[PDB]
Design an enzyme around this catalytic site. Structure first.
Site, PDB file in Angstrom:
ATOM      1  N   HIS B 150      41.327  33.468  30.879  1.00 26.61           N
ATOM      2  CA  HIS B 150      40.957  34.878  30.929  1.00 26.61           C
ATOM      3  C   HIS B 150      39.648  35.170  30.208  1.00 26.61           C
ATOM      4  O   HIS B 150      39.021  36.197  30.484  1.00 26.61           O
ATOM      5  CB  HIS B 150      42.069  35.738  30.331  1.00 26.61           C
ATOM      6  CG  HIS B 150      43.301  35.807  31.177  1.00 26.61           C
ATOM      7  ND1 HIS B 150      44.550  35.479  30.697  1.00 26.61           N
ATOM      8  CD2 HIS B 150      43.475  36.162  32.471  1.00 26.61           C
ATOM      9  CE1 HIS B 150      45.442  35.631  31.658  1.00 26.61           C
ATOM     10  NE2 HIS B 150      44.815  36.043  32.745  1.00 26.61           N
TER      11      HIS B 150
HETATM   12 ZN    ZN Z   1      49.498  34.099  32.313  1.00 25.53          ZN
END
Ligand code: ZN
EC number: 3.5.1.98
Lengths: 107, 382, 129, 503, 18
Positions: B150
């Site tokens: 992320h």
């Molecule tokens: Zn995840």
């Protein structure tokens, strides 16, 4: 009902808690964070009570209620884990003794 | 074209028995994210203890990757962001509040002890796995300490500070012509996907729950931009997917792209939050379904690196990671838990298998058929 | 009652130390077959026909052993920790057995009253809620 | 009792300030209404502003006393925003990476899953505390063993800089503050940093004792944790098995059934969102294709009447025949028979107009029925699949109401038979008891008796007229309160279909 | 006197003063 397991915060503001979750963040375990009750001057991090008795912690009496126990004493006295630990230790002992004989010959 | 295929038990492929290099460090499990935090590196220690007590060390070479330096991290990240990350401590955040609001650190990326050390060790694990996979010294690198996707070039979000995946991808690209990336995490690989939009070298496929979820990106129309057109496929799904549905929506796409893209190297994320009983997940997969993807990818005989991310209930992610590690060695697991330190945390039955939940699946077959229709239509262009 | 507690305590420490031992076995398991093969090849009767071969085989054995001492010493260390922790646990266990068996006392009676209060406090935590 | 006499005196002062007996009684009514959790706090203070607002001090006491873009999700960064220098980037990293395009953004868990998450979090918190205690114990042990060899002169001037030679200076602070109290934690840390010689041994001893105490406490709590996990984990698999259970618990309330029809009316037919077609006459469609699902349910009913605790034998003998009477009268199956241009000849469509009681009974009937009609299409399939069942489920449902079988095994019995196809047969006892209770309240009430007599008279006629229906409506309304919600039921003999409509 | 805490913590600092 309580809102646990939703990452939208669009139309779920109506539900219990759910003011700490949002689409922006990943964490959604906040709604089920336990709450505290101050009883006898100390906090306690609180139908499970009916399904599971908690008062089973009570210590055994000296009349040998060992067999008819609170589903916990029997679990340990019937646990065969000690035998498995002994077998693992002795298998390690054999594995090391083979090498020990090898170095004894090489010495 | 989507067709219903019932799930079948997993059996290893004895055709290949490639070397497995399970990177691990004993200091990663010490770091903590908070008190009520769901993300815990302790699950890596749980999985490693399960592997150790299971008898799997005789096959795989366990390593200890050297932590990465700042200059290595600068291959993708910005000097300012990595400087702030190194300098920030759980004590001097007040003086660093400007960067904290600018770099988005504090809300979902809490500052804790040894945070820079955590990022460095994950980056070094991915870097050394890629280095081993590039020199020919190995063919599978189980870098379970990584799995941080992320994170972006100048931002840290979703408990993800340093994007080690793209660093390993760049290392592979040092001498490989084309590289390919896979995802199994319920969320979307925003940083990894974005890192290679305009170029053909890297492809980023993500099987991500779409809609009102954490990343909120990665629709079916994220074809690409510029010369990287049609080289970033996405497979958005819905809540409640099961093992057979996941297999049917996973395998044909991979087969088609590797027929077309023809990757020279492969990396596979192994997010453990897409299982039943998960805390931050919304799927219904089991360990068999989770291991199906890694077994399928490995069966194609290509240099692959397995990284480990996600996982917010200890037992599920630990068992899934142990099963994946075993199946990477072409060895089926005993499926019985040996006694170890964390034996008390493994359910009331102490069995390796975890039963998937009964919850209602939502993925309609026609929606999946249309989704793979667009996927194949856009992939056919190249 | 302390016997129950020490019975719970045994496996946890034993398993922690055994996991450590498994890790030490893991980091050096790829040299035991090599060492055994080198020793067996050395002890072959048709080997002494070239002095340089004897020298090189001895050098290989020496290098393997130089790599193998560290694992052995770490094994001694962890086994010593095992022994002392298990000694303490067994000490507690057999004091508990001796006390429980000698009489088929007011201090241990008080601990029941102290725990009775906790049981009374926890039982009333559901009624009062 | 310590903080009650002050409130008593304050309320006495308020009563004296009011001075009026009737106003005091009104204030008492206000506070009693608040005591029933019906009045909001803002409403309460705005109301008390009228009474005690004259006295500023008493009002204050009360107030403080009660509280360019390309792609759907990607936007091109401007030319000025593309310069974030990175020294580690080489030629390949420049050519093969992007710095001009940035992406932009555009289910209820079961309660037992939440309980398992809480249990896991508590276990991990205990584990983290124990591990931090172990690390701090090791650090203090190495510090003590280093200082013991040191001489007395260096001991006197020994100063401990922050960090304690640890990979994280904040690791031991949390453990120290946990072992001690929060107010003394900073003092203890400062004393350790300034007087390590006298502080390290005693703090190490405290840590050694607390490790044993915490381990014993964890092993004591593990009994309850094990029991909770054993008794809850099995239940924590059926997401549909419990959510539908609570839905069935909350559904069969008197308001909800009429709420369904009123909602569907006001949404589809009354609103006319299309605004192109006239509203349909009816709302819901039901079918009664099979008649063998009648004898078994009647036997279940007779079992409940023969097993019920609170019912009289003269009442039970009536109930044993009432059900046969309604089935025979409604579905035409087997005064003495009753006790046992608009003129259309040989009518096949019949109308039943009644109050909430008959409607609730009919809705209970249909809710029990559609649970059994769905398994009709899957009985043969599951019979095929089990060996790779209607009598079995019937006999398994027999033994619950009579008490032969406990409630628990019913849920797990159907699990293996139907993994996900059947999730509505788990609460048959509750709906059956609701239906029998509603039949009893149908028979007992005199107004419902008159309604059933009017329905009997209407049904006994094989030919209806335009004026006859109006006469029937007027007669049923004669003893009927106007405020009550009017419903109508039409049953079609031709297709064995029963329809309903909200008036 | 049958306590559990609030006394040993004082004896800790009481020993410091001696
Ligand atoms: Zn995840």
């Amino acid at each position: 009902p309580e809102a646990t397991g939703i990452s939208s915060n669009r139309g779920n503001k109506l539900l219990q808690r759910s003011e700490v979750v949002t689409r922006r963040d990943l964490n959604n375990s906040k709604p089920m964070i336990e709450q505290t009750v101050f009883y006898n001057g100390s906090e306690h991090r609180l139908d499970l009570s009916k399904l599971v008795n908690v008062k089973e912690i009570l210590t055994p009496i000296l009349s040998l209620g060992d067999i008819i126990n609170h589903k916990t004493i029997s679990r340990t006295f019937s646990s065969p884990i000690l035998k498995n630990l002994a077998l693992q230790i002795i298998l390690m002992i054999e594995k090391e003794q083979m090498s020990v004989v090898r170095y004894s010959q090489f010495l | 074209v989507y067709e219903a295929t019932p799930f079948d038990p997993i059996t290893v492929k004895p055709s290949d028995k490639r070397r497995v290099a399970y990177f691990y460090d004993a200091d990663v499990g010490n770091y903590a994210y908070g008190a009520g935090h769901p993300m815990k590196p302790h699950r890596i220690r749980m999985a490693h203890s399960l592997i150790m007590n299971y008898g799997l060390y005789k096959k795989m070479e366990i390593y200890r990757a050297k932590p990465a330096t700042k200059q290595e991290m600068c291959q993708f990240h910005t000097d300012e962001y990595i400087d702030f990350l190194s300098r920030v401590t759980p004590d001097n955040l007040e003086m660093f509040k400007r960067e904290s609001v600018k770099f988005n650190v504090g809300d979902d990326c809490p500052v804790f002890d040894g945070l820079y050390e955590y990022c460095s060790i994950s980056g070094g694990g991915s870097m050394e796995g890629a280095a081993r996979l590039n020199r020919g010294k190995c063919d599978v690198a189980v870098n379970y300490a990584g799995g941080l996707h992320h994170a972006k070039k100048s931002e840290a979000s979703g408990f993800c500070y340093l994007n080690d995946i793209v660093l390993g991808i760049i290392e592979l690209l040092r001498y490989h012509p084309r590289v390919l990336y896979i995802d199994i995490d319920v969320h979307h690989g925003d940083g990894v996907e974005e890192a290679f939009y305009t170029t053909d070298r890297v492809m980023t496929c993500s099987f991500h729950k779409y809609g009102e979820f954490f990343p909120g990106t990665g629709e079916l129309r994220d074809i690409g931009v510029g010369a990287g057109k049609n080289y970033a496929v996405n497979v958005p799904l819905r809540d409640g997917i099961d093992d057979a549905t996941y297999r049917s929506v996973f395998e044909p796409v991979i087969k088609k792209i590797m027929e077309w893209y023809q990757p020279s190297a492969v990396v596979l994320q192994c997010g453990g939050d897409s299982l039943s009983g998960d805390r931050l997940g919304c799927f219904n997969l089991s360990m068999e379904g989770h291991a199906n993807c890694v077994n399928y990818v490995k069966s194609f005989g290509i240099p692959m690196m397995v990284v480990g991310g996600g996982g917010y209930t200890m037992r599920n992610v630990a068992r899934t990671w142990c099963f994946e590690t075993g199946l990477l060695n072409n060895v089926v697991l005993d499926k019985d838990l040996p006694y170890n330190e964390y034996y008390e945390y493994y359910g009331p039955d102490y069995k390796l298998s975890v039963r998937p939940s009964n919850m209602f699946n939502v993925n309609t077959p026609e929606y999946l058929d249309k989704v793979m229709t667009n996927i194949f239509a856009n992939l056919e262009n190249t | 009652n302390d016997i129950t507690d020490v019975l719970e305590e045994f496996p946890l420490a034993t398993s922690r130390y055994l996991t450590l031992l498994h890790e030490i076995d893991a980091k050096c398991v790829h040299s035991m077959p090599n060492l055994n093969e080198r020793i067996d090849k050395f002890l072959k009767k048709d080997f002494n026909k070239d002095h340089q071969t004897q020298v090189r085989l001895l050098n290989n054995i020496n290098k393997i052993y130089e790599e193998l001492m560290p694992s052995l010493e770490e094994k001694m260390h962890v086994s010593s920790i095992m022994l002392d922790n298990l000694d303490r646990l067994t000490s507690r266990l057999e004091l508990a057995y001796e006390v429980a068996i000698k009489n088929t006392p007011a201090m241990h009676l008080h601990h029941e009253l102290m725990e009775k209060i906790e049981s009374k406090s926890n039982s009333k935590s559901s009624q009062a809620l | 009792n310590i903080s009650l006499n002050e409130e008593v005196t304050f309320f006495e002062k308020a009563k004296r300030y009011i001075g009026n007996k009737h106003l005091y009684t009104e204030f008492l009514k206000i506070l009693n209404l608040y005591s029933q959790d019906i009045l909001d706090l803002d409403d309460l203070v705005e109301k008390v502003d009228f009474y005690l607002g004259s006295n500023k001090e008493l009002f204050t006491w009360f107030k403080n006393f009660v509280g360019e873009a390309f792609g759907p999700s990607y936007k091109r960064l401007p030319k000025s925003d593309t310069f974030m220098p990175c020294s580690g980037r080489d030629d390949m990293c420049w050519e093969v990476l992007n710095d001009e395009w940035v992406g932009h953004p555009v289910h209820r868990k079961n309660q037992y899953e939440e309980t398992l998450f809480k249990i896991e979090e508590e276990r991990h918190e205990y584990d983290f505390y124990i591990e931090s205690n172990l690390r701090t114990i090791q650090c203090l042990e190495t510090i003590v063993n280093k200082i013991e060899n040191m001489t007395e002169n260096e001991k006197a001037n020994f100063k401990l800089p922050p960090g304690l030679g640890h990979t994280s200076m904040t690791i031991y602070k949390k453990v120290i503050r946990k072992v001690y109290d929060k107010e003394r934690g900073f003092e203890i840390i400062d004393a350790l940093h300034e007087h390590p010689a006298v502080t390290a041994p005693v703090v190490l001893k405290r840590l050694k004792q607390k490790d044993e105490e915490w381990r014993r406490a964890q092993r004591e709590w593990n009994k309850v944790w094990r029991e909770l996990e054993q008794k809850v984990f099995f239940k924590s698999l059926d997401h549909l098995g419990l959510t539908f259970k609570q839905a069935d618990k909350k559904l069969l309330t008197t308001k909800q059934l009429i709420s369904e029809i009123s909602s569907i009316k006001v949404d589809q037919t009354n609103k006319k969102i299309h605004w192109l077609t006239p509203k349909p006459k009816s709302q819901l469609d039901f079918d009664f294709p099979d008649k063998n699902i009648f004898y078994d349910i009647l036997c279940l009913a007779d079992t409940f009447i023969t097993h019920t605790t609170a019912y009289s034998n003269p009442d039970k003998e009536r109930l044993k025949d009432l059900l046969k009477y309604f089935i025979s009268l409604f579905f035409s199956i087997s005064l003495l028979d009753i006790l046992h241009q608009g003129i259309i000849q040989n009518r096949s469509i019949f109308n039943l107009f009644a109050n909430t009681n008959i409607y609730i009974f009919f809705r209970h009937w249909t809710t029990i029925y559609e649970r059994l009609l769905e398994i009709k299409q899957m009985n043969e399939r599951v019979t095929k699949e089990i060996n790779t069942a209607y009598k079995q489920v019937l006999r398994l449902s027999r033994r619950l109401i009579n008490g032969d079988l406990e409630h628990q095994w019913f849920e797990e019995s159907l699990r293996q038979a139907y993994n996900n196809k059947a999730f509505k047969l788990y609460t048959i006892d509750k709906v059956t008891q609701s239906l029998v209770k509603h039949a009893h309240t149908l028979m007992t009430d005199a107004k419902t008796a008159e309604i059933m007599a009017l329905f009997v008279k209407d049904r006994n006629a094989s030919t209806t007229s335009a004026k006859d229906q109006i006469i029937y409506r007027l007669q049923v309304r004669s003893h009927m309160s106007n405020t009550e919600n009017m419903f109508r039921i039409e049953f079609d003999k031709r297709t064995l279909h029963v329809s309903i409509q909200y008036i | 006197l049958n306590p559990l805490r609030d006394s040993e913590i004082n004896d800790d600092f009481h020993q410091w003063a001696q």
